[PDB]
Structures are given as structure tokens and as C-alpha cells.
Amino acid sequence: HTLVWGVWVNGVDQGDGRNIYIRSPPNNNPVKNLTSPDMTCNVDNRVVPKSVPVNAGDTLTFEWYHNTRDDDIIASSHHGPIAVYIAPAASNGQGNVWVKLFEDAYNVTNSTWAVDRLITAHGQHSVVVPHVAPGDYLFRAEIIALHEADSLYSQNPIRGAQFYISCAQITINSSDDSTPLPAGVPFPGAYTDSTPGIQFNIYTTPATSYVAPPPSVWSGALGGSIAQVGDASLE
Numbered sequence: 101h102t103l104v105w106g107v108w109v110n111g112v113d114q115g116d117g118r119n120i121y122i123r124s125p126p127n128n129n130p131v132k133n134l135t136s137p138d139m140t141c142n143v144d145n146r147v148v149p150k151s152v153p154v155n156a157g158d159t160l161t162f163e164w165y166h167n168t169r170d171d172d173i174i175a176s177s178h179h180g181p182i183a184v185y186i187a188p189a190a191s192n193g194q195g196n197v198w199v200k201l202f203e204d205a206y207n208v209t210n211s212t213w214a215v216d217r218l219i220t221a222h223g224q225h226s227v228v229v230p231h232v233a234p235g236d237y238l239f240r241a242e243i244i245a246l247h248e249a250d251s252l253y254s255q256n257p258i259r260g261a262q263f264y265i266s267c268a269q270i271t272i273n274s275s276d277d278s279t280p281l282p283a284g285v286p287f288p289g290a291y292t293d294s295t296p297g298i299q300f301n302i303y304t305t306p307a308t309s310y311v312a313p314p315p316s317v318w319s320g321a322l323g324g325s326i327a328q329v330g331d332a333s334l335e
């Protein structure tokens with residue numbers, strides 16, 4: 101259980117974004133139904149009033165939280181990978197529009213999952229804004245918790261992979277548009293019961309053998325890291 105509070109741009113806190121520039125759900129319950137429109141931007145996908153100004157090459161930092169900002173972020177049980185997708189706001193998340201900018205499953209070195217390092221990062225992870233057409237975008241941050249992903253939701257609806265999905269409203273002002281955004285995958289649609297990384301046993305199988313769900317990170321991506329960029333406590 102976890103949600104996005106707001107974003108930092110080049111280490112500058114953009115302030116509380118909930119229901120403002122984040123399409124926030126009413127709570128931190130996971131999404132589990134792979135076929136649900138809830139897979140797009142969570143249970144309450146609607147245009148919210150603001151879109152954060154950025155330029156190509158900016159560092160965009162998502163900040164997640166559990167109950168209060170900068171608390172314990174997400175339960176230590178929720179081991180899994182972190183992905184960030186972009187789509188043109190045009191789409192409102194519909195159709196084959198989601199392009200991956202970032203993937204992080206397991207760091208062999210440190211022996212930590214992305215979720216472990218997100219907790220350490222006080223809920224902060226970042227992507228470098230790509231050189232796409234200036235305009236309005238959704239950035240979809242996705243945490244997959246696998247603590248029950250040994251089952252499929254479709255077979256056993258009290259277990260299954262859990263998706264913590266947050267769509268940020270981002271307006272890209274300055275960019276040379278040197279990497280125009282290609283068509284992408286649909287959500288719902290890209291994840292099915294057979295897709296790798298959806299069904300996996302973190303209790304029996306080694307984390308080095310884990311293989312995150314496709315698609316692959318777009319070559320136009322400039323991402324990206326899991327690490328604190330600024331102190332929320334200084335406000």
C-alpha cells in the first residue's frame with residue numbers, strides 16, 4: 101500500500117500534487133485485475149486541474165508515501181520492480197500509447213529490489229525527461245509488489261501480483277523533439293496471466309532469476325534512478 105504525494109523537478113519540490121497534478125486514487129489499495137480500466141491510471145482516472153512544467157533533460161522525481169508524506173513509504177513485504185511509462189495526454193491512457201522510460205527489478209550488487217531502495221530513497225525515484233514533442237503528457241509510475249504473485253488474481257482473487265499505479269500530469273515546454281514518442285502498449289492489455297514477471301514466487305525462486313514484464317525500455321529513454329533528491333522534512 102502506497103501513493104504519490106507530488107514530484108520534484110531538478111531537486112525542487114513542486115508541492116502537494118494529490119488530485120491537483122496527480123490523478124490520485126481515493127486510497128493506497130492495490131490494483132490486481134489485469135483487464136480492468138483501473139490498470140491505466142488507477143481507480144479514478146480523470147483530468148485534474150494542473151500539469152507540472154518541465155523541459156527535456158530535467159530530472160523528474162516521483163515521491164511516494166504510505167499514510168503520511170515521508171513515512172515508511174510502502175510495507176517491506178512488497179518486494180518487486182519499478183517501471184515508469186509516458187503517454188500523450190491526448191490518449192487519456194486509452195489505446196497503444198504507453199512507452200516505458202524506466203525498468204528496475206533486482207540489483208545483484210546490493211541484493212535489493214527496486215521497492216527496497218525506494219523505501220531507503222524516502223519514496224523518491226526519478227526519470228530524465230526525454231526529447232519528445234513539446235506538449236502535455238501522463239507519466240505512469242508503476243510498482244509491482246509480488247508478495248502474493250505466486251498466484252494469479254484471475255484464478256484466486258484474494259492473491260495475485262499487486263500494481264501501485266500513479267499517473268502524473270506533465271507539460272513538456274522546451275524540447276528539440278530529437279526523439280519523437282513512438283506508439284506504445286495498452287494498459288489494460290500489455291500484462292496478461294502468461295506475461296513474464298506477473299506470476300513469480302519470491303519465496304522459492306531467486307531474485308536474480310526474476311524477469312520484469314515487457315515491454316522493453318524505449319531507446320529514446322534517458323532515465324533514471326531510485327534515490328532521494330531532496331528533504332521533504334525541511335518544510
Ligand SMILES: OC[C@H]1O[C@@H](O[C@H]2[C@H](O)[C@@H](O)[C@H](O[C@H]3[C@H](O)[C@@H](O)[C@H](O[C@H]4[C@H](O)[C@@H](O)[C@H](O)O[C@@H]4CO)O[C@@H]3CO)O[C@@H]2CO)[C@H](O)[C@@H](O)[C@@H]1O
Pocket residue numbers: 101128166167174175177178247248
Ligand atoms: O510477509 C510475507 C507474507 O506477506 C503476506 O501478505 C501480507 C503482507 O506482507 C502485509 O504487508 C499486508 O499488509 C497490508 C494489510 O493487508 C492492509 O490491510 C493494510 O491496509 C491499510 C493501509 O496500510 C493503510 O495505509 C490504510 O490507511 O488503511 C488500510 C487498512 O485497511 O496495508 C498493509 C500493507 O501496508 O498484509 C498481507 C496479508 O495478506 C502474504 O500473504 C504471504 O503470502 C507472505 O508470506
Ligand SMILES: *[C@@H]1O[C@H](CO)[C@@H](O)[C@H](O)[C@H]1NC(C)=O
Pocket residue numbers: 133134135136137257
Ligand atoms: C476484471 O475487470 C473486468 C473489466 O472491468 C471485469 O469485467 C471483470 O469482472 C473483473 N474481474 C473481477 C473478478 O471483478
Ligand SMILES: [Cl-]
Pocket residue numbers: 101
Ligand atoms: Cl497486501
Ligand SMILES: [Cl-]
Pocket residue numbers: 156231274275276277
Ligand atoms: Cl531540448
Ligand SMILES: [Cu+2]
Pocket residue numbers: 101102130175178
Ligand atoms: Cu500493500
